[PDB]
Design an enzyme around this catalytic site. Structure first.
Site, PDB file in Angstrom:
ATOM      1  N   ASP A 111      76.208  36.159  32.204  1.00  0.00           N
ATOM      2  CA  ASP A 111      75.163  35.723  31.532  1.00  0.00           C
ATOM      3  C   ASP A 111      74.737  34.610  32.094  1.00  0.00           C
ATOM      4  O   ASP A 111      74.934  33.501  31.638  1.00  0.00           O
ATOM      5  CB  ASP A 111      74.786  35.850  30.033  1.00  0.00           C
ATOM      6  CG  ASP A 111      73.485  35.603  29.809  1.00  0.00           C
ATOM      7  OD1 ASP A 111      72.338  35.776  30.845  1.00  0.00           O
ATOM      8  OD2 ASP A 111      73.307  36.126  28.585  1.00  0.00           O
ATOM      9  N   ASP A 152      68.582  34.740  36.478  1.00  0.00           N
ATOM     10  CA  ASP A 152      69.209  35.292  34.929  1.00  0.00           C
ATOM     11  C   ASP A 152      70.549  36.884  35.167  1.00  0.00           C
ATOM     12  O   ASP A 152      69.315  37.506  35.107  1.00  0.00           O
ATOM     13  CB  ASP A 152      68.150  35.443  34.009  1.00  0.00           C
ATOM     14  CG  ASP A 152      68.720  35.825  32.391  1.00  0.00           C
ATOM     15  OD1 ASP A 152      70.203  35.471  32.875  1.00  0.00           O
ATOM     16  OD2 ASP A 152      68.373  36.493  31.375  1.00  0.00           O
TER      17      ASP A 152
END
Length: 364
Positions: A35, A220
């Site tokens: 992440d 992201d």
């Protein structure tokens, strides 16, 4: 030896890309979501019916508690965990162990979801986003110190339309083709980068470039879809609708899937990013393959609105080899051999282009 790290991720855009890690002494094996949109290393610390394993601190002789807990809140989902430290090894990369901060989740809501295969998360962004505070050293900053590797990592995601690679400490030439293009990190918190322009079917959207950086444009891998601030979202929908012409309202909102390939009916979408040379841009381009996503065919629109950010999520990163060059405060993009569906290209990268007709600073 970056070759060890090739083929070390499982999963896809929708269920996340995850790395196997060994935690504690004796090593407990966990599946960890990569992440780039957060900065905590957090793992299940108690049983949960939607996960198959958790990290038990009481079975690890090397675990040490740090004497506080932390609560993390997302737009959807949250968790509270104990903060401690323990040794980790990453079998597919770093077979020598290193000491890292870890949050062990004992309570949560809408975090561990049905059908998901990971049982923690590896936040790879900067300390400024670390919770409770930036003094909690991130996993990657610990690794850089202790393993003495360069302050860079890269990601190949191969799930377009399988798994991929997370390379810690640099770049693997076999994971990309052609030239790498770099855009400056504008702010070290998220991987914030500067978007100058969006182009649909070769025609630029008619919005002030500040709208693309409204709060922030970021990269992201923990976000599934391309997310666009509401205003950009609505303009893109109108441009794509008009450049195609097949539509129910629900298709654009993900309320409905279209069943029929349709890819030939839909336009290319190009995002233009400022080059490390201020006077130039380059372009990353997704083809309909990456945003008209087959479900089972039946197809979902792979773009959603956000309140606060334009997010270059995993569905777009599946088009490219992406370099998180923290040492030089830049993000790199390059063409990726594995970004194919039936051997067909799903993305394009091209440059340079002049920035003579865009503002000097598109970040408001």
């Amino acid at each position: 030896n970056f070759l060890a790290m090739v083929d070390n991720l499982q999963g896809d855009s929708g269920r996340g890309y995850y790395l196997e890690m060994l935690i504690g002494t004796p090593p407990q094996k966990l599946q960890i979501l990569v992440d780039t949109g957060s900065s905590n290393f957090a793992v299940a610390g108690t049983p949960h019916s939607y996960i198959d394993t958790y990290f038990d601190t009481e079975r690890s002789s090397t675990y040490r508690s740090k004497g506080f807990d932390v609560t993390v809140k997302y737009t959807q989902g949250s968790w509270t965990g104990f903060v401690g430290e323990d040794l980790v090894t990453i079998p597919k990369g770093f077979n020598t162990s290193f000491l890292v901060n870890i949050a062990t989740i004992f309570e949560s809501e809408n975090f561990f979801l049905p059908g998901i295969k990971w049982n923690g998360i590896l936040g790879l962004a900067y300390a400024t986003l670390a919770k409770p505070s930036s003094s909690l050293e991130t996993f990657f900053d610990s690794l850089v110190t202790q393993a003495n590797i360069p302050n860079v990592f890269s990601m190949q995601m191969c799930g377009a339309g399988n798994g991929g690679s997370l390379v810690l400490g640099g770049i693997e030439p076999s994971l990309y083709k052609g030239d790498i293009w770099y855009t400056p990190i504008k702010e070290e918190w998220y991987y914030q980068i500067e978007i100058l322009k969006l182009e649909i079917g070769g025609q630029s959207l008619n919005l002030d470039c500040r709208e693309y950086n409204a709060d922030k444009a970021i990269v992201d891998s923990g976000t599934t879809l391309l997310r666009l601030p509401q205003k950009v979202f609505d303009a893109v929908v109108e441009a794509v609708a008009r450049a195609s012409l097949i539509f129910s309202d629900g298709f654009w909102t993900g309320s409905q899937l279209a069943c029929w390939t349709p890819w030939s009916y839909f336009p290319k979408i190009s995002i233009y990013l400022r080059d490390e040379n201020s006077s130039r841009s380059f372009r990353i381009t997704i083809l309909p393959q990456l945003y008209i996503q087959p479900m089972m065919e039946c197809y979902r629109f792979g773009i959603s609105p956000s309140t606060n950010a334009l997010v270059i999520g995993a569905t777009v990163m599946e088009g490219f080899y992406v370099i998180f060059d923290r040492a030089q405060k830049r993000v790199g993009f390059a063409a990726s051999p594995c970004a194919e569906i039936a051997g067909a290209a799903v993305s394009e990268i091209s440059g340079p282009f002049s920035t003579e007709d865009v503002a000097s600073n598109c970040v408001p």
